[PDB]
Amino acid sequence: MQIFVKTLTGKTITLEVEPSDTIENVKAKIQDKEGIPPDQQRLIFAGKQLEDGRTLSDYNIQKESTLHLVLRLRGG
Amino acid sequence: RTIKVFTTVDNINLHTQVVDMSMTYGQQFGPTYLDGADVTKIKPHNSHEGKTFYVLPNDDTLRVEAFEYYHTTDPSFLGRYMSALNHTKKWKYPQVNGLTSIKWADNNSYLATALLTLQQIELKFNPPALQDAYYRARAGEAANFCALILAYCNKTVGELGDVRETMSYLFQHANLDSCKRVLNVVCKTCGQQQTTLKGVEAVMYMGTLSYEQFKKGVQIPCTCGKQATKYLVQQESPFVMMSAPPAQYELKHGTFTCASEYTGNYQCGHYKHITSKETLYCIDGALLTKSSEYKGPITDVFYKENSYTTTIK
Ligand SMILES: [Cl-]
Ligand SMILES: [Cl-]
Ligand SMILES: [Zn+2]
């Protein structure tokens, strides 16, 4: 099934995924397509932060769903 | 030849020990710390008589006490907490109009921003370690609280950090059990979908800084291919944290509790803390600037709540 991922520039990315895919799995698929290291990535579903080691099914993310990709801040 | 010392996991329950002065603490107790310093490979000294040493739990008594005090089973936790403590004891914790801050050192701006925030939102910590260290921190002695935050968030002293991520991990250790959020998503074609979130998920939002905009409605994609409206139906919590990628934002006096300003880029940035009192305060470590207005690159805004119900039918 396909999901969409909106980047900070407004670029939309298509991924192929399965409901049992963990968030880490989705982060690898984005690393594959955009080369962003998974450690920098934060996935958001309609305002809710998706956490590592939960699945798309856990968050009831269905086909044609849109995620937002934001990046961790580096404050010092 | 032997001295008496106390071993502990929590610095509250002390266990009298008689230590063989011809063997290292390590051979006798396992990993051992004295006021943060690792003394595992060190032999007992005269002036150690009567002193308290932290030890890694190596029996069921210390394991139970450790879990009861910290609420974690991570065997790396004590060493990480002790490593951070050696640095945080050297930081300066100035009072800035009645709040404990931190002077800048070791890339600690995200930590100082979190500490200031925690003093302004109603939060009950579950682990006794965080409850005890918080009360000391509020009185100006924040070194143990700062080292605990670094240990719980899996951060090292000097590592760059994210306030939103720090708050999120610490909220896992707070009693937010009864916090509740109800949302409605309305597509003119598909109809209405209501969602209920509880605990940490009920007090966080990433996408807009405006609590008022969340109440009024935000446009999101519906899987049908149209735009739907999402709005807050109900919020039951003592605060909400509204976050967004950093962007120029005007903070209006009396309309929020406090906020995180992030200047820089995704490689390197600096946080300041803005709080609304009799006027707007911008706290930058030890420095305090008072202004009637404030505009800057804001990334988190905290609002006080108790119970909100929408009037949207
Ligand atoms: Cl103990
Ligand atoms: Cl507390
Ligand atoms: Zn629809």
Author numbering:
A (entry chain B): 1 to 76
B (entry chain A): 3 to 315
Paper text:
We determined crystal structures of PLproCoV-2 with an active site C111S mutation, which inactivates PLpro, in complex with hISG15 at 2.98 Å resolution and with K48-Ub2 at 1.88 Å resolution. By contrast, for the PLproCoV-2:K48-Ub2 structures determined at much higher resolution we observe strong electron density for the proximal Ub bound to S1 site with only weak signal for the distal Ub in S2 site and no electron density for Ub in S1’ site. Therefore, there is sufficient room in our crystals of PLproCoV-2-C111S:K48-Ub2 to fit the distal Ub at site S2, but the binding mode of the distal Ub may be less defined. An alternative explanation is that PLproCoV-2 (C111S) can hydrolyze the K48 linkage slowly, leading to a mixture of Ub1 and Ub2. To test this directly, we ran SDS-PAGE gels of our crystals and observed predominantly Ub2 with only a minor Ub1 species. The structures of PLpro in both complexes are similar with an rmsd of 0.85 Å, but the binding surface contacts of the proximal Ub are shifted towards the fingers domain of PLpro compared to the proximal UBL domain of ISG15. This shift in the binding mode is manifested by a 21.7° rotation around the C-termini of hISG15 and Ub, displacing the N-terminal residue by 10.3 Å. The affected residues mapped to the binding interface in our PLproCoV-2:K48-Ub2 crystal structure, and the slow-exchange behavior is also consistent with the sub-μM Kd values. In the PLproCoV-2:hISG15 structure, E70 is close to S22 but does not form any clear stabilizing interactions; by contrast, E70 forms a long salt bridge to H68 and K6 in the PLproCoV-2:Ub2 structure that may have been missed by the in silico analysis due to the larger distance (>3.9 and 5 Å, respectively). Thus, we cannot exclude possible additional modes of interaction between the distal Ub and PLproCoV-2. This might explain the low electron density for the distal Ub in the PLproCoV-2:K48-Ub2 crystal structure.
The Papain-like protease (PLpro) is a domain of a multi-functional, non-structural protein 3 of coronaviruses. PLpro cleaves viral polyproteins and posttranslational conjugates with poly-ubiquitin and protective ISG15, composed of two ubiquitin-like (UBL) domains. PolyUb and ISG15 have common other structural features: ISG15 comprises two Ub-like (UBL) domains and mimics a head-to-tail linked di-ubiquitin (Ub2). While K48-linked Ub2 (K48-Ub2) and ISG15 are similar both in sequence and fold, the topologies of how the two domains are linked are distinct.
